[PDB]
């Protein structure tokens, strides 16, 4: 406008609790509208204010008002935010951060106005003492308020839970101190308002006499009683908050301003109080605080109708629903006409039904399995029972899952649950561990409440009336203080020739178990932590097997293929080079497996490699005639690929009971709480079961768990990069460091992030213990340019995409001590031939794209990662920093120090074993199936943890009925798939499908689909889809950013896919098989999965040929035979027969 008139220049600011002058920004913005740029050639700005305030306006609008930093008022808040974010760790970091603020610049230019004399500037030109004094003064305020743990000795700052809440919610230090002193678990709704009204944000809010009468009318109408008086500021704040929630109409301008200011800061203050209460575990206070946060944001009481959250509904209809005081859940079961008739609003009945179904409502299912006597595994399935709406719900719905005891006062397990819009109408699996006390409560409360939606909470009482908790595990075998065992304790001189230069004395675990393993012939169970030398006990058993007869046959079973490769190399140079003993490694080929087993004295193989040979142990004499069966990592039977190991171990015990010569089973594994079941299942006695504790390792393990309360995985992964560098500098500045990454892509980012944190400080290239002259020979053989850039700085990286030469070179550089930090992927924990002093486990979870959820890492993988931080002679102790989310912090603390409870999972994957046993004639009837199942670990674990296997008791009728039902269910699945034939409902026989399934080691489901999906007119075009749909490809890795790449490969393959879903592993396998057949370029991550698919592709092709051979289809058999040849040659059937030859491009074909 041409003329602008600012009348009064006085605004009642609720923050100061009085009428203050207009701000500079408001005056400048108001004065900027004087004079239109189009028609006005000269503006006119009138500023009517007080005579004493005329100078401020003249200087502000005349370029005479200096910009002075006001950071002194909120110095502690800014310092707390930097400390919480990790930007500043000690006093020096805070001083450096303070130097980049406007206060430091203003303090140097104008020290007099900042409280600094000219003498101080002369004695400190850089202004370092003033920054230290300001940081110390700010740190004292933060330390006095319990915001940060600051010690005056070293100046280091420790981030506390209150500081994170205060920095996250912008709450002042005084407000945090008030919330800590006044925040109690027994605070009611009335006290919650008083605590909020006592915050430091409303310290200037005063109760004026001009509005006392109006406050009295609000005090008699507020639903929440106030123990304070009307003349106290706390009552006015509590009354203002209650009036805003109740929608009471105010009259005073000052009262309205105070209510708006109180309501605006109430949202952040309420969230901070809820976070503090939620962190403390107060279930009763958390529900009230969470309800209060939603009530303030929603501007409605919790007793009001839930339809008030949807602003599109009429108020008269909402009031009519409120007048008819009926339960909110009652409208869910009513139809559109019933809802309209119940409220007497037939016209709005359809809208009410649409609004009722659009409200968040999740159906909770509880699957509780007691892992231990004090720890229970709760698998909560959340099913969204509401129609998703972007205009009402948005991109995602935030919910909180709170686990509480019977009293509903202590939060056993609280975690955030983000319900994304793309993942609506689907069950979400939430797995967590809740503690169980000696006083077993009748039930637990699982409250899934919305984080923003009021009256949206689902309560699921997890009753423990029929919960049979496992019996208290026996104490682990104590490490007797025997004298160290010298090499002379062994008998054979040649046996001591392979350990003379290694160590003069054995470890205490080896000395205690050496007498039972080397000087004994009974089954020995050695439960010791990863790194105590369990392989030496197996070698003692191998030496015992080699002492009785020079032609012995020791069998070493490793749950991981990499462990067998590491053991095969270790065994080859020790058992073959120095003892002249045939040590061989089992392959995936059974044709060469029989020759290797018959010609080798030590047979190292995986559970899958030995299962194929052991399935026909009746015919194969080499499998039965075994003098020793070593099972390393027996604790792996409670995880993936564990049912095969349990079946192999059970088969080995059953074979040893009928061969006229027992097979000495040496079961080595981690320290397990339920070691009696493993010893009982493996035939180990009470004195031969060496089940130790995790704290008995030769190298003491210092395990530190850092909780990250970040729900998002990307933010949590990025926020832990700073902590990884801080943990390395605090735990091992000059020691090897191993960092575990959740994926192959995170290793490169983590390696650069550590370098970036190291480059931020003056300690550049501090992770390279050697010089660049000696790194040229190793850096020139690497293919990854980024690895050389990180390797030159002293920080290595490891992932599945790296070639073996690069992985071997990286391990060699780290083993020799040239490098200090190695960033290894989560999948490389088993395959790592090196150990560091400090082990970093950051983001202990993986993004499983099959279910679109962040699945936590298994305990076995974490145990191996923790075991990697074990230096026997070079390090006196071992550090392990486990950076994980706060929800899983309790799970790691229980399963890390205490023995690991292992439970067999053969009940879900017993179909393959049952078919193999039926084909071998081991199980000829239903009674034999139950008898065969009694030799496995599942039967032994069913009597100790019946609740884990859906059992109701340990009695014979319950155990016999459960085993019969499991046998009758697995047998029914085999009969329905045409794998076996059941005659008279009791006797089972092997069918054609079962023989093929158990011959090539194929899943029963794959054979059922092959037999029902293979016709007489099948071709190679449809053959790939049938092969790609086999159950063996369901374990393919689906990760983030893997759907876009597959889509690009779906338009280039020679075969189209009908209805291709990017989340289905079968589709990726078909695309990968087509890509391998066309020899097209693929990413490193895609090629890693292609090799895994190609490993089992040959067996599936052979099964298809066998299935077609029995079906009498010549055409389908020929296509399968051509596919098998084409799969090995990476060539297509539609192309010429010359692409198989190496170095032949399309030019030769043309």
């Amino acid at each position: 406008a041409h003329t602008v008139i600012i009348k009064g220049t006085q605004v009642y600011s609720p923050e100061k609790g009085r009428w203050t002058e207009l701000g500079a920004l408001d005056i400048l913005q108001m004065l900027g509208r004087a004079g239109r740029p189009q028609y006005d050639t000269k503006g006119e700005g009138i500023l009517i204010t007080s005579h004493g305030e005329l100078q401020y306006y003249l200087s502000l609008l005349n370029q005479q008002l200096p910009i002075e930093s006001q950071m002194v008022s909120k110095l502690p808040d800014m310092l707390n935010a930097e400390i919480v974010l990790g930007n500043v760790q000690n006093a020096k970091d805070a001083v450096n951060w303070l130097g980049y603020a406007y206060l430091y610049i203003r303090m140097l230019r104008s020290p007099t106005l900042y409280g600094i004399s000219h003498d101080d500037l002369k004695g400190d030109p850089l202004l370092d003492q003033r920054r230290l004094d300001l940081v110390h003064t700010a740190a004292l305020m933060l330390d006095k308020n319990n915001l940060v743990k600051y010690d005056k000795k070293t100046g280091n700052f420790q981030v506390t839970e209150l500081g994170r809440i205060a920095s996250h919610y912008y709450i002042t230090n005084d407000t945090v101190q008030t919330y800590n002193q006044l925040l109690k678990p027994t605070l009611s709704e009335i006290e919650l308002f008083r605590v909020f009204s006592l915050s430091s944000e409303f310290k200037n809010i005063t109760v004026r006499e001009e509005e006392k009468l109006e406050l009295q009318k609000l005090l008699e109408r507020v639903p929440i009683p106030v123990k304070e008086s009307i003349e106290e500021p706390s009552a006015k704040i509590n009354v203002l908050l209650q009036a805003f929630i109740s929608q009471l109409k105010l009259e005073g301008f000052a009262l309205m301003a105070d209510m708006v200011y109180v309501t605006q800061s109430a949202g952040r203050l309420m969230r901070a109080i809820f976070e503090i209460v939620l962190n403390r575990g107060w279930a009763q206070l958390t529900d009230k605080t969470l309800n209060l946060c939603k009530m303030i944001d929603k501007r409605m009481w919790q007793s009001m109708c839930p339809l008030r959250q949807f602003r599109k509904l009429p108020e008269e209809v909402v009031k009519k629903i409120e007048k008819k005081n009926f339960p909110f859940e009652r409208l869910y079961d009513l139809n559109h006409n019933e809802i309209g008739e119940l409220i007497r609003m037939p016209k709005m009945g359809k809208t009410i039904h649409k609004y009722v179904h659009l409200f968040p409502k999740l159906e909770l299912s509880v699957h509780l399995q007691p892992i231990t006597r004090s720890t229970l595994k709760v698998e909560l399935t959340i099913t969204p029972d509401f129609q998703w709406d972007e205009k009402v719900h948005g991109s995602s719905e935030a919910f909180w899952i709170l686990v509480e005891d019977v009293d509903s006062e202590v939060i056993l397990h609280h975690e955030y649950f983000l319900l994304k819009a793309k993942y609506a109408q689907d069950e979400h699996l939430i797995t967590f561990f809740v503690p169980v006390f000696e006083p077993l409560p009748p039930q637990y409360f699982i409250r899934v409440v919305s984080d923003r939606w009021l009256s949206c909470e689902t309560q699921l009482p997890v009753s423990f009336r029929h919960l049979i908790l496992p019996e208290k595990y026996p104490p682990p075998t104590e490490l007797l203080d025997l004298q160290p065992l010298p090499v002379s304790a062994l008998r054979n001189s040649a046996f001591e020739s392979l350990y003379q230069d290694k160590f003069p004395f054995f470890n205490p675990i080896q000395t205690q178990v050496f007498n039972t393993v080397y000087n004994s012939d009974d089954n020995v169970f050695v439960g010791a932590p990863t790194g105590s030398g369990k392989t030496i006990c197996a070698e003692f058993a191998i030496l015992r097997m080699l002492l009785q007869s020079s032609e012995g046959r020791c069998v070493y079973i490793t749950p991981m293929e990499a462990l067998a490769e590491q053991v095969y190399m270790d065994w080859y140079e020790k058992f073959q080079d120095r003892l002249n003993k045939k040590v061989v490694l089992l392959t995936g080929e059974t044709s060469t497996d029989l020759k290797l087993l018959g010609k080798g004295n030590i047979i190292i193989s995986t559970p899958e490699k030995w299962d194929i040979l052991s399935r026909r142990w009746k015919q194969r004499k080499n499998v039965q005639n075994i003098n020793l069966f070593v099972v390393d990592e027996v604790h792996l039977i409670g995880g993936e690929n564990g049912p095969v190991l349990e079946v192999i171990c059970s088969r080995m015990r059953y074979i040893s009971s009928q061969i006229e010569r027992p097979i000495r089973i040496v079961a080595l594994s981690s320290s397990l709480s339920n070691a009696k079941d493993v010893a009982h299942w493996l035939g180990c006695s009470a004195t031969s079961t060496f089940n130790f504790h995790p704290n008995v390792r030769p190298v003491p393990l210092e395990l530190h768990i850092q909780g990250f309360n970040i729900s998002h995985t990307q933010t949590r992964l990025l926020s832990m990069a700073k902590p990884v560098y801080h943990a390395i500098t605090k735990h091992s500045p000059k020691k090897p460091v191993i960092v575990f990454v959740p994926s192959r892509k995170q290793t490169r980012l983590t390696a650069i992030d550590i370098l970036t944190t190291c480059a931020a400080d003056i300690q550049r290239q501090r992770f390279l213990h050697c010089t660049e002259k000696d790194l040229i020979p190793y850096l020139e053989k690497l293919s990854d340019s980024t690895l050389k850039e990180t390797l030159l700085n002293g920080v290595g990286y490891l992932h599945e995409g790296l070639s073996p030469m690069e992985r071997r070179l990286v391990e060699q550089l780290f083993s020799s001590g040239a490098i200090q930090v190695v960033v290894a992927s989560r999948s490389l924990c088993w395959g790592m031939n090196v150990a560091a002093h400090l082990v970093i486990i950051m983001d202990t979870q993986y993004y499983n794209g099959k279910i679109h959820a962040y699945v936590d890492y298994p305990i076995y993988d974490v145990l191996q990662m923790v075991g990697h931080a074990n230096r026997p002679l070079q390090d006196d102790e071992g550090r392990c920093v486990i950076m994980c989310q706060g929800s899983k912090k309790d799970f790691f603390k229980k399963f890390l120090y205490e023995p690991l409870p292992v439970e067999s999972h053969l009940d879900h994957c017993m179909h393959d074993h049952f078919n193999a046993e039926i084909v071998t004639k081991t199980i000829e009837n239903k009674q034999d199936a139950v008898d065969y199942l009694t030799w496995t670990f599942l039967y032994r674990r069913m009597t100790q943890n019946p609740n884990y296997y859906n059992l109701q008791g340990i009695s014979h009728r319950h155990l016999s009925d459960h085993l019969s039902e499991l046998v009758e269910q697995t047998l029914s699945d085999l009969e329905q798939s045409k794998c076996i034939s059941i005659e008279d409902e009791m006797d089972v026989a092997p069918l054609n499908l079962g023989m093929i399934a158990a011959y090539y080691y194929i899943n029963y489901t794959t054979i059922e689909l092959f037999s029902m999906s293979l016709n007489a007119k099948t071709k190679v075009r449809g053959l790939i889809e049938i092969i790609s749909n086999a159950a063996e490809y369901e374990n393919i890795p689906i990760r983030h950013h893997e759907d876009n790449l597959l889509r690009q490969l779906a338009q280039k393959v020679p075969h189209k896919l009908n209805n291709p879903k990017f989340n289905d592993p079968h589709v990726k396998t078909n695309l990968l098989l087509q890509a391998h057949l066309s020899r097209m370029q693929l990413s490193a991550e895609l090629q890693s999965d292609t090799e895994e698919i190609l490993s089992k592709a040959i067996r599936l092709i052979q099964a298809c040929v066998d299935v077609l051979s029995s079906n009498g289809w010549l055409s389908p058999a020929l296509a399968a035979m051509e596919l098998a040849q084409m799969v090995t040659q990476a060539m297509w059937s539609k192309d010429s027969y010359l692409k198989q030859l190496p170095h032949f491009t399309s030019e030769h074909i043309k």
């Binding site: 002194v72 006093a91 230290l132 004094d133 300001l134 003064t137 700010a138 004292l140 305020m141 005056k152």
Partner: peptide, 7 residues
């Protein structure tokens, strides 16, 4: 050497 000042 640090001195607490009047914030």
């Amino acid at each position: 050497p640090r001195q607490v000042l009047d914030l």
